[PDB]
Design a protein around this nucleic acid. Structure first.
Ligand SMILES: NC(=[NH2+])NCCC[C@H](N)C(=O)O
Ligand SMILES: NC(=[NH2+])NCCC[C@H](N)C(=O)O
Ligand SMILES: NC(=[NH2+])NCCC[C@H](N)C(=O)O
Ligand SMILES: NC(=[NH2+])NCCC[C@H](N)C(=O)O
Ligand SMILES: NC(=[NH2+])NCCC[C@H](N)C(=O)O
Ligand SMILES: NC(=[NH2+])NCCC[C@H](N)C(=O)O
Lengths: 155, 160, 166, 155, 155, 161
DNA sequence: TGTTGCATAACGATGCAAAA
DNA sequence: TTTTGCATCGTTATGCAACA
DNA sequence: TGTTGCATAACGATGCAAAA
DNA sequence: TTTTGCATCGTTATGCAACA
DNA sequence: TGTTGCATAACGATGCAAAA
DNA sequence: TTTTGCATCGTTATGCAACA
C-alpha cells in the first residue's frame, strides 16, 4: 500500500469504471485493499491530471485521465484568429450601403463567416453565408463601405 | 442592440459566448457576468444550462480551481457519451419518419429542421453512432458496427 | 403508405402526421376533411376532423374548386410560392420565435435574427409561411436570418415586432 | 336580367373587404341596396371563379377573385417530372454498396434531390444533398448499384 | 502505308500506360519494334485526337484518347444561359432598397444563384442563396427595384 | 468602380478561372497579360503552379495543335485521371478534427462550417478509391468504392496530414 | 410538458496539525 | 521532510412546487 | 510552413528539305 | 505526292533562394 | 406551454317549389 | 325557361377540458 503505488491502481480503476464522485472512489479502493479518505483522493486526482468529463447532456460526470493532451477543444478564439483566416481565404471585398460583400473560394463561405462572428465586432450586426459569398451587416453609423475596406486592411 | 432574448435560447447562446472569451471558474461568477447584461438567473438553472451545453470545469490553473470550457461542435468530448434528455425532446417535436438500410438510419424532418435535429444528436455523442450529416428535411445517422441501421432507427422511434 | 413492415415508420405526432398530410393532398384528389381522415387511417394514422382542421389550417391549405362544380380539391402552397393576396399567420411563428430566437438587431431595411446553430433555416421557414405584408422575404444561414422589410417599413421596426411577440 | 349587374358589384366588394363568410356578404350587399340570400350567393361565387383563400396560419379565410390564372401552385408532381429534371442536370452516376452517388452541376444538388423525394420511389429510403453531390439510399434488397443504373436509364 | 498501322499501336499503349511526355512515347515504341522521332509523334497525337489530361493537382499530365466526345466540361457560360434558367425556375420578383429578392422552388435557390454569378453583371455586387430565396445586391446608383424588374423582363 | 479583388492565391485563382471561362486563352503568358489588365501582376512560374492546382487542361479546340484552357466544373471531374493530394493534405492538417468509419463509409469531422470547404478539396483530388463526398456543417461522408473499405479510407486521411 | 427558483444535500479543494 | 486525515467551506447537483 | 520570382531545363509544335 | 527528320522557337515545368 | 378529443355552433352546397 | 328562397344536411371551425 505504497503512496506512489496507490495512484497507479487508481489509473486502472478509472479506465474501467464510471467513477461518479470521490466517495465512490474510496469504496472502489476500500474493497480492493487500499483504504483512504475523500480529502486525500482529491489531492491525487489533482496531481494525476485526472478531470471530471461528461457528455453534452450526461449529467454529473466521470473522472478520467487525459490521453494525448487537452481532453476538450472548446469554442474558437477571437479577432486575431479571424485576421489569419481572412487573409487565407478572402477572394474579394465590395460594398453597397450598410452591406459589405465578401467573396470566398467555393464552400469556404461558412467557415470564414463563422470566424467573423467569433470576433464579435461591435460594428457588426451579424453575418450570413452562402457558398462563395458572405453578407456582413454593419450597424449605424458604420457603413458597409467601411467594413469592406476594413476587412481588406487585415487580409 | 443586439437585444438578447429572455429565454434559454438567448441565455445559453450568451453563456457560451462569455465562457469562450473569459476565465470563469465558478457558476455564481457566471451569474454575475450575465447580470452585467440585464440577464438575471439563479445558479440552479445555470447548473442545468451548462450541463445541457456539455461544459466542463477543466483545471487550467495549475491548482484545483480551473476554468469552464464548452466543447466546439465537431469536437465532442473524448471518453464520455451521455445525452438524451434534450435529443428526446427535439426528437418528439421534429421527427417525421424513421427508416433504415444497412448501417444507415434515415430520419426525416420538416423543411429546414434537418440540421437543427442532427445537432442535438451530435451533442448526444451516442457510442453507437459514428456521426451524422443533414440536408434540409433528411438526416443520415451512421451506426458504428456491430450496431446496425435498423437498430438505430428503432431507438429513435421509441424514445420520443 | 408507410409501415414498419415494408417501409418508413411514420411518427405519432404533428411533425409526422402533417408531413404525411401534405404528401397525400399532393398525390391525391381530396375534397373533404373526413375523407383525409380515412386515407390517413389507411396508414394506421387515426385522428379526428377537429385537429385535421387545425392542421391544414396551419399548413395554409386551401380548398380550390378544381371540379367545375363547387366541391373542389385541397392544395398546399409550395414553399417559395406563398398564396397571392392574403398574409395571416403568427400563432406558430410566435411559438418557434420564443423557442429559437436568440437576439434581434437591425440596420437599414434589414432585420437580423440570431438562432442556435442549425436553427436558422427552420425559423425562417415559419416566417416565410407567415407571409407578413411588411416582409419582402427571408434568407437563412446556420445561426442567422435576414428579414428584408418592404418600404416604407424599416429594419428597426421589424426587429421590434419579432421582439415583443414571443 | 339584373342578376348579372349584381355580380359586378360583388367583385368590387371583395377587392376591398375581408369577406369571411357568405352571410357577411349578404350584409355587405344589404346595406348597399342589393339584397339576396345565402343560397344564391353560393351560386354567384361558384360561377364567378371566386375562392376562399387564406394565409399559412390565417384561420378561416377570405373570398377573392383569382387574377392571372391559378391562385395557388401547390406541391410538385411525381416520377415523370423527376425524369425530366434528371436528364437535364445529372452529371454522373456511380455506386458503392447500398449507396448511389449522383453528381450535379454546382448548387443544382438540392433541387434535383427534391424532385427525387417527390417521386417517392418505394425502392428509395431517402436522399441527402450537398452542393454538387447527392446520396440516394436504397432499401434491401435493392442495391445502390441498381439505383445508379436505374437513374441512368431515364436520363 | 505503315503510317496508319503505327497509330493503332499508340492507342493501345496509352490505354495502359501513364505516358508523361512524347519522348517517353518514343521509348515505349522503340522497345516495341516501331521506331520514330518526337517531331512526328506530335503529329500523330494531333490528328489522333489525343490530349494531355490531368487531375486537379496531378502535376504534368498524361496523354489519353477522348472517349464519348468532350473529355472535360469546363465552367458554365454567361448571360444568355442565366436567362434560360431564370425563366425556368423563377417564382417571384420583389425588392426593397438596393436589394432584389428572388424566390425559387424549394432547393432551386443555389442553382439559379450560381447562374446569376456566372453572368457577372456589372450592375450586380454579388448574390447569396438560401433554399427558396436569393438576395441580389445592386451597386449604386442601380437599385434593387431595377434589378427586380430587370430579372422579370427576361423570365 | 467595381469589386476589389484580393492580393493572394484565393483572389488570383478565383480571378483566373473567371477569365479562362469567358475567354480563349491558349498560352500561360497570355493569361499573365489579361491578369495584368486588372492590376494583377504575377510570373508564369506561379501561374503554372496555379492552373495545375486548379486542374486546368489545355484541350485542343482549334483544329490545330494550339488549343485553349478549360477548368473542369465541380461535380464534373476529369474522366480518366485522378492525381491530387498536395493541397488536400494541407487543408486536411488544418481542418481535420477526427477520423472514424463504418462499413464503406469514412466519417470526417471538422470545425463548424468547415465541412463543405474540406470536402471540395477532396472532390478535386478525385481519388480512385472514393466514389464521391457529401458535406454538412461539421461532418463529411466519404463513400469508399469497393473493394476499398471505410476503415481503409479513414486510415489514409489520418496519416497524410 | 417544459422551465425556473428555492432550499438542501452532495461534492471537492485547502489550511493546519499529527504521523511516517 | 512529507503525507494523510480531520474539518471546513466554496461549489455544484436536485427534489419539489409553482407556473405557463 | 506556405509562397513567389528568377533563371534554366524540359517539353511540344512547325517550317523546310530530303526520302519513300 | 506524302512522310519523316532536322532544327528552331514558342510554351510549360522546376530547382533554388528569398521572404513572411 | 403545446396538443388533442368531444360536442356544438358556424358555414356552405343542393333538391324542390314558387316566382319573374 | 330561369332564378331565388326555403330548408336541409354534409362539411368545417372552435370553446373547453383533459393531459403531458
Ligand atoms: N453552390 C454554388 N456553387 N453556388 C454558386 C453561387 C453561390 C451564391 N452566390 C451563394 O454564395 O449563396
Ligand atoms: N427543400 C429542399 N431543399 N429539398 C432538397 C433536399 C432534400 C434531401 N432529402 C435533403 O434533405 O438533403
Ligand atoms: N457554424 C456555422 N456555419 N457558422 C456560420 C455562422 C454565420 C453564417 N453567416 C450564418 O448564416 O449563420
Ligand atoms: N461548391 C462546394 N461547396 N462543393 C463542396 C462539395 C462537397 C460535397 N461533394 C457536397 O456536395 O456536399
Ligand atoms: N426548406 C427551407 N429551408 N425553408 C426555409 C427557407 C428560408 C429562406 N427563405 C431561404 O431561402 O434561405
Ligand atoms: N451547426 C450545425 N449545422 N449543426 C448540425 C450539424 C449536423 C451534422 N453533423 C452536419 O454536419 O451536417
Amino acid at each position: 500500500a505504497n503512496r506512489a503505488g496507490r495512484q497507479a491502481r487508481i489509473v486502472a480503476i478509472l479506465s474501467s469504471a464510471q467513477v461518479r464522485s470521490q466517495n465512490e472512489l474510496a469504496a472502489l479502493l476500500a474493497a480492493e485493499g487500499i483504504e483512504v479518505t475523500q480529502a486525500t483522493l482529491s489531492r491525487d486526482l489533482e496531481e494525476l491530471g485526472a478531470v471530471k468529463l461528461r457528455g453534452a447532456d450526461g449529467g454529473t460526470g466521470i473522472y478520467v485521465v487525459p490521453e494525448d493532451g487537452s481532453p476538450v477543444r472548446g469554442v474558437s478564439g477571437g479577432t486575431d484568429r479571424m485576421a489569419r483566416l481572412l487573409g487565407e481565404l478572402l477572394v474579394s471585398t465590395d460594398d453597397s450601403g450598410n452591406l459589405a460583400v465578401l467573396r470566398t473560394p467555393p464552400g469556404a463561405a461558412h467557415y470564414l463567416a463563422s470566424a467573423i462572428d467569433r470576433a464579435a465586432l461591435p460594428q457588426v450586426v451579424g453575418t450570413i453565408a452562402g457558398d462563395d459569398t458572405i453578407l456582413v451587416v454593419a450597424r449605424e453609423p458604420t457603413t458597409g463601405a467601411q467594413l469592406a475596406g476594413m476587412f481588406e486592411n487585415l487580409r
